[PDB]
Amino acid sequence: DVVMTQTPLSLPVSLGDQASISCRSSQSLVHSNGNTYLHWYLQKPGQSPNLLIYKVSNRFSGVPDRFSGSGSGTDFTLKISRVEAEDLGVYFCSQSTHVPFTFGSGTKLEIKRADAAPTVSIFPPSSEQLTSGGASVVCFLNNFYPKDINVKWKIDGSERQNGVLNSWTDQDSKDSTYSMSSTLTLTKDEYERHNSYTCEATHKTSTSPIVKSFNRNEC
Amino acid sequence: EVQVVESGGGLVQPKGSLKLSCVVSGSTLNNYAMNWVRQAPGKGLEWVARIRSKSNNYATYYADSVKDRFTISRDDSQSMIYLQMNNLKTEDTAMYYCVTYGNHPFAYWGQGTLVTVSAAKTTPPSVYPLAPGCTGSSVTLGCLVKGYFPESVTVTWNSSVHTFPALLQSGLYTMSSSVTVPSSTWPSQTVTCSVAHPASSTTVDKKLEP
Amino acid sequence: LPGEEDLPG
Known part of the structure; x- marks a missing residue:
């Protein structure tokens, strides 16, 4: 298991700027035969990966000269000289010097914009769901940047971990923001046993959480 | 090639x-x-x-x-x-x-x-309305689409829409969709999420009400 | 191609 470590895992870029991605191996990728079998792939959403660079610095046929690879031993860099919209996607480094063949985790090249705090809203369980014996509480956290965000659920002041499901959109094509849905699923039994339901979102835009809540008995 | x-x-x-x-x-x-x-x-x-x-x-x-x-x-x-x-x-x-x-x-x-x-077997979703109220110039509504199989539903609203990727929850899929309308438009104009799950032969048209 | 596998014996 030659571990392939890519840095950073998320890379915000302004179009037209240079970008560099680091890939480091847990051991040397230099083979006895003098070759270094280290390669780079780009994967665009809903597509098979495309080869960019093989054996450190060789560009594959059809790949624009704005992509270049370098490095040696355990230390490798892909550079894109002037990023284009076409270049956005997930970059993977690959080693094939050692079996098992391994891949880096992927570096997602995304659009840099101004930080934006989420618009947050909370929704109680529907009467429909409650009739059926379940009770999902939902929080939408919409149009924020960057994508990193901490959502905390609280019931009657105490934090809750179980029954929470979080889903993020991909970066918006128009405004370059992200959105996320957080759903706490309880039993109707737990729901009818507690009264105060809160979703708290902390994001780098502010040191204070965005707090949204309701009281069951008021609905 | x-x-x-x-x-x-x-x-x-x-x-x-x-x-x-x-x-x-x-x-x-x-x-x-x-x-x-x-x-x-x-x-x-x-x-x-x-x-x-x-x-x-x-x-x-x-x-x-x-x-x-x-x-x-x-x-x-x-x-x-x-x-x-x-x-x-x-x-x-x-x-x-x-x-x-x-x-x-x-x-x-x-x-x-x-x-x-x-x-899992091929299962229709339960479609739940997400409405505020227990305002502001804009209001956000949603639909929760819970416990379906196999994958791929489509939610259509009757664009300030977000469609949240489906995830696994107890062997079945759950997704959600949000829409944001001016507060002047809902609940004066009807807003409906229409959820289609082709595999189970279902379309749910869920009117959102306060 | 794809050509011969470019990896050692």
């Missing part, structure tokens, strides 16, 4: 077996290695198996995670590659790609074949 096409994917029960096939077209002889690489939903690339050319004694190699559950082979008289998977686990759920390794590493990929390893 060399073309690669995988096939044989589908729905299989845990502990079950599945053979995937691959054909390479527009190629010169069979003097190259072939690989299978997989990708679990929302995850990275995982190399799975490698079979070398005749010249390299058709040598085979496997990822530790699949070794001795998977077997790879090749029939060069038809330029076919095979992946036999046994004792499948829910974690083997992935898109499976057949990939060439000739002069260039992992150069030519198929579009992939989808393998879902699951015990």
